[PDB]
């Protein structure tokens, strides 16, 4: 049977420098993330799940009282692995590729799409994510924030990109500078590579 | 009218080293704490609640979804300076006064109450916090475990005392390892003088 892996990250440790640090990506990939994965196994294990794909599991467990500790792991282990393909190295700014037409279309501008995606990714109360989503392959763009763990799948929506606003992956470099966090992912962080690969229902980057 | 305040931390700003650091205590109350009092006074200036008490504050806006973020920040700081004043330079440890045999009446002992607390701790998945609660003052006594801003009063429960589990409560001194924290907590920081007091609907503690 398959199991659930750690994909690496898609770029070296000092690559996100000096935007998100060598340090929180140790902690935040090869600890955080790297549980969630371990739990979801240790969950499965000898049960109707193992062997079912990430997505699969999600699916089967949204939801589910009796099976959200599963949900919890699964989908955690999707968002932080969707997030890791959202930057890159030199990323950032306006958008590039098919995307920055459909965002002006759907916000009217960059502007106003990293306005709203930066209020989404602020007012987030707790721990979540602020989401870039479509509501099928190429279909139409819509922002959502979501708590804990839960993820666009678990609401029939295509994510095409995403930012952890859980504490840990931005205090080692931020402290309780949410917004800073915020501005720096917009401005240097943002792969639309990737964004786009997703929204086009393509496969890209490091998942496995 | 009164105005909502920042209470001073119970102690200096070393006095629960090695267990919270100096740095935690700025960030976590010199900032977090003192941005949930500034975002309160800010809702409620000029409105029906302005010269209210946090407690009555909280009455106005539990379970009113038009009212979250005067409810999360009022919740947020009663909740923070609860706990400020469950930690004592020299705490934790078994109990002394009458919530020894109170703890060993609810839950058999001592070390059964400290596990239980320890799990709901360790298991509060997202932000939040663990409790030690009475149903009235002098009463019967449970441990709960709340998501975010929501807190014991808003249940109709007596606080007798709590962590915070947020990650940036321990990320700056455990990173990820929350359990040590947790552990840490029991067996270092609890202040039973300011537990016994809550559990008697006694005045205590540095709460303005
Ligand atoms: C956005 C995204 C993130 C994923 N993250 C993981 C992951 O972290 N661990 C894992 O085992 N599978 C993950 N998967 C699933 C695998 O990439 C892959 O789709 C699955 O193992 C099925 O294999 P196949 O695509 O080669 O048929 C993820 C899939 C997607 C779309
Ligand atoms: C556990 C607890 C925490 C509190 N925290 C604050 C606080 O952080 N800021 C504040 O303005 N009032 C806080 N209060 C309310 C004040 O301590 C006080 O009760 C209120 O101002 C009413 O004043 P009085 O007790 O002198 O009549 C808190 C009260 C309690 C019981
Ligand atoms: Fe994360
Ligand atoms: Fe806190």
Redesign the interface.
């Known amino acids: 049977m398959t199991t659930i892996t750690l994909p690496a990250l898609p770029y070296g440790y000092e690559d996100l420098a000096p935007h998100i640090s060598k340090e929180t990506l140790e902690?935040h990939h090869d600890?955080?993330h790297n549980?969630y994965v371990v739990n979801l196994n240790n969950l499965i294990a000898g049960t109707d799940l193992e062997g079912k794909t990430l997505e699969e599991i999600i699916k089967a467990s949204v939801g589910d009282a009796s099976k959200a500790g599963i949900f919890?792991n699964a989908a955690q282990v999707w968002n932080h692995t969707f997030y890791w393909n959202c930057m890159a190295k030199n990323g950032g700014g306006k958008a590039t590729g098919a995307l920055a037409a459909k965002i002006d279309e759907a916000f009217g501008s960059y502007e106003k799409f990293a306005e709203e995606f930066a209020a989404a990714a602020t007012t987030q109360?707790?721990?979540?994510w602020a989401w870039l989503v479509a509501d099928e392959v190429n279909g139409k763009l819509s922002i959502m924030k979501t708590?804990?763990?839960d993820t666009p799948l678990a609401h029939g929506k295509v994510a095409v990109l995403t930012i952890d606003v859980?504490?840990?992956a931005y205090?080692?470099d931020f402290?309780?500078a949410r917004p800073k966090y915020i501005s720096t992912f917009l401005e240097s962080l943002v792969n639309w590579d990737y964004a786009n690969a997703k929204y086009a229902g393509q496969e890209a980057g490091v998942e496995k």
């Not at 109360?125 to 979540?128: A, D, L, P, R």
């Open positions: 902690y600890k955080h549980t919890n109360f707790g721990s979540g708590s804990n763990a859980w504490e840990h205090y080692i402290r309780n």
